[PDB]
Symmetry: D2
Subunit: 230 residues, 4 copies
Amino acid sequence: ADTIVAVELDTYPNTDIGDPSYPHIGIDIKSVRSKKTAKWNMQNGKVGTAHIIYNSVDKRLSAVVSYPNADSATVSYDVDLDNVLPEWVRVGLSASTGLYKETNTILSWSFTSKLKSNSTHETNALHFMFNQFSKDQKDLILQGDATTGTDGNLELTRVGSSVGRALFYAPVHIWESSAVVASFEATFTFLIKSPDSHPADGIAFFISNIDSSIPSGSTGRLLGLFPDAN
Amino acid sequence: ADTIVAVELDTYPNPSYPHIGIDIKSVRSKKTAKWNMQNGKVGTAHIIYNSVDKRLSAVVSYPNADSATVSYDVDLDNVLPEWVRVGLSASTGLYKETNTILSWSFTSKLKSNSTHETNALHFMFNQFSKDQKDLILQGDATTGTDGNLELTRVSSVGRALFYAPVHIWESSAVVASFEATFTFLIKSPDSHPADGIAFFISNIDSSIPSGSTGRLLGLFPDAN
Amino acid sequence: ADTIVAVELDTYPNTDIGDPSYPHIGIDIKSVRSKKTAKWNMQNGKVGTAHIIYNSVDKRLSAVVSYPNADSATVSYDVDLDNVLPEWVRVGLSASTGLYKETNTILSWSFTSKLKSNSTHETNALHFMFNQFSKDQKDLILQGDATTGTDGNLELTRVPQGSSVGRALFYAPVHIWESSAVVASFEATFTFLIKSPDSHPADGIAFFISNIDSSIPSGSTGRLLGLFPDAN
Amino acid sequence: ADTIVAVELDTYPNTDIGDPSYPHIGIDIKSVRSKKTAKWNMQNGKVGTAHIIYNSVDKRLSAVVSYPNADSATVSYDVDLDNVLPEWVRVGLSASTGLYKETNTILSWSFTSKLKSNSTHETNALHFMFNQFSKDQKDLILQGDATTGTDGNLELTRVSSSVGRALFYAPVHIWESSAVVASFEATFTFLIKSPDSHPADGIAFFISNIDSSIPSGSTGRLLGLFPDAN
Ligand SMILES: [Zn+2]
Ligand SMILES: [Zn+2]
Ligand SMILES: [Zn+2]
Ligand SMILES: [Zn+2]
C-alpha cells in the first residue's frame, strides 16, 4: 500500500477504535488510528485555516486549526519522518463525506519544503501557492470526485458518500540523508458546509508515495487515505 | 512544432560574435548583445519578465567583469500557451566542452485583481542529485556528478525541464511575472569553443526536435 | 528639500498647465508635475490594489492600479533611479484630502527590494508585509494625521472642517541601489479604500521613495500630496 | 536591564558557574547561565553556519551549528517566548573576545519572522538577508567594536578584550496576542579565527528589548549581553 503521513480534521462518529468520541484533529502515521489527537470544534459553514509544520531539528510534526474568532485546536507528535516516508513523495489534500450532503471546499492552499545542506548553504526549495484554482489546473492531479474551478475553488468532494483528493503534480524531496535541516510547512483554508448540523466528515492534508491513489473502499471514515481501519 | 521563447548564450560562429539573444519562435534572435564568454569561469544569468512592462530582459555577468544585458518588448500572452514547462538546454559543437549548471532557481506569479489572488510557483536547486525526480532530463543531460547538472554529455545536446507545468499567464491576472537565475560553467580546452546554453519556455510536451544539434541549441528544427 | 520619486493616485482638479483634467495615476520625479500619467477611474468606496515595480535591467518604473471587476490603469516611465535617488532611502505612503471628508485607508502594504551582486549570488534583500496594522506599530514612522490600529488598518488621513495630510514610512532605511549590483529591483503593493460622501472628491494617495529624513514639507497640503513644497 | 533571549556559541573556560567545562552552544533565557547546552566542537578558522528556529505551536526554541564536513551540535528548549520577551524587540548578533586575539567574523546573516493571524490570512512578515555588508550599513545599529565593510563582512569584534554587537534597525514584532502562529528563523555564517588553538571566545544571536545596549562590564564570558554572571 501507500505510506501515508496525514493530518486529519475528522468529525466522523467513529467511536470505532482509539477514535475520539468527539470531533478532533489528529496526526496519522500509516494508519487511520491517529497517533495523537486533540478536540476540534468544527463550525459548519465557517472558513477555517489549517497550518502544519515540521522540521528535522525538532522532529516534531505539528498542526493548528483555527476559525476566525474562535479557538484553535493544536496537536503535535514527535516523529522522525526519515524513518517513515520515502525520500520523494507527493503532498495533497483529501476529504470524504458520510451519508450526508456537505461540501469540502478548499479556498486556498500553499506549501513550502526546504533541504538546507551542511556544506555552507546548499538550500533546495519548492514552494507553491494557490489562492485561486482554475477549471484546468494542470499542476494538480485530481482524484475521486475532486474538481477545481467552481468559483475559483477546489471541491474535494462531489457537488452523499464522496471521496476526492488533489495532489500537487511535482514529486517533492521531503528529506535527504545529507540535509542538516529539512522542513516543510503547509497552510490551507477550508469551508465545511452541511444542512445537518452534525455532519460526519473528513478532510486531511497528506504526504504519500508519489504514486499513491485512492485505495479501494477507503470511503467515509477512511478519508480516501486508508484501505482499512487497522 | 513546439512554441519556444528562449534566452540563448551563443558562441556559435555565424552576429559574428559571442552574444546573448532573445529568441521568439526562431533561432534568429529578435535582439542580441555581445557577450564575452569566459572559458572555465562561473557565470550567472538572470532573466525577468512582467506583464506590466511586457519586457523580457536578461543579464549575464561573471564575477569581476562586465555584464551583457538584452531586453525585448513582447507580450508573452500572445506567444506562449497559458501552461508551459520551463527548462535549460545546451549544445556543443565539434569540441569537448562541458555545459555545467551549478544552480537554478525560478519563480512565477499571477496576481489577480480580486484583492490578492496571487498564485505562485517557486523552485530552487543549489544541488542536483543523481535521482532528481522533479526534473525531466532529455538528451545527454544528466544530474548528480558533483551535485551538478551536466546538460551535455562529457556534438552533444541535452535539456532539463522542471516537472510541473507552470501557468505563465492567465487572462485574468493584473500582473503576471517570472524570474529565473542559473549559474553555469562553460569549460573547454580550445579557447574559442562553439557552444550554446539557453533558458527556455515551451509547450509542456516539448522535446528535443530532430537534428536540432549545434547552433540550433536543441531547441529549433531549422535555422528559420 | 527631499528627493522624492512617487507614484500618485490623484483625483485633484489641477487643471492648471498640461495637467490632465481627469483622475489619473502618474509617476512623479522630484516634482508634482508628473513625468507621465494615465487616466484612472477612481471608485468611491471600493477597495483597489496598486502594484509598483522597477528593476535596473530595464530601468523602467511601472505601476498598475486595479479594482476588482474593472479595468486597470497602468503607467511606465524610463528612468535610472541611480541617477536620481540617494543609495539609501525610506519608502512610505502618503495622502492628502481636499475640502472634502473622505478617508484614505490602507488595508495592506508589502514591499521587497533586492540587490543581486555579480559575485555569484551576493543577494541582499529586505521584505516586509503588513496585512494588519496595530495600534502601536513600531516599525512604521507615522507623520501628519496618519494613524494605525483602527480596525487593523492605516488611516493616512485624519478621520470643524478642512484638509488633512499624513504619511507612513517603514522604519528601516532601504538600500535601493548600489554601484556594484548587477540587478537591483523593488516591488510594492498596497490596497486602499477611498471613501467619500461627495461622489467627486478631490483626493490623493501616493507610494513614495525619499531621503531617509524626509518629513512632510510646510504647506504641502491638498494637491501637493504631503510630498512637495510647491507646484514646480 | 535588558530582557535577553540568546543562543550562544561559547568557548569560554568559564568553568565559572553552571558553565560547562567544554565548548558548548546553549540557550540562555535572561541569564548567562544557559537553560540548556550541548557540546560544540569549535573549528578554528573554518566557516560554520548557525540556524535558529522557533514557532509558537511547539514553543520550542532550537539551534543547530554545523561546519562543512563535520557534525552538528543541536540544542532545544521548551519556552513560550510570549511570557519572556516584550511584543516588540530588536534582533542582533554579539561576540566578545577573551585575553586572546581572534576575530569574530560574520559572513552572512538572514532573519524571518511571521505572525499569521486567525482572520483568514492576516500574515505579517519581516525578512532581511545580508550576504554582503557594506562600509556604511545603515539598516544595522553597530555597538561596541563592531564594524562592517572589511571585505564585505561584519567584524563583531575589534580586528586590529573586545565586545561588539550588530542589531537590525527596525524593531520586530515577535509576538502578538492574536496570532495563531508566530515564528522566526535566523541563519548566520561565522568564522572564528585565532592563533592560540583554544581561544576563549563567544558569539550569540540574540533578541532583546528595542533599546538594548552593551551592559557595563559585560566583557569576556558575559558576551556583551549580561551585566553579571546571575
Ligand atoms: Zn479520527
Ligand atoms: Zn544566436
Ligand atoms: Zn497628478
Ligand atoms: Zn556558556
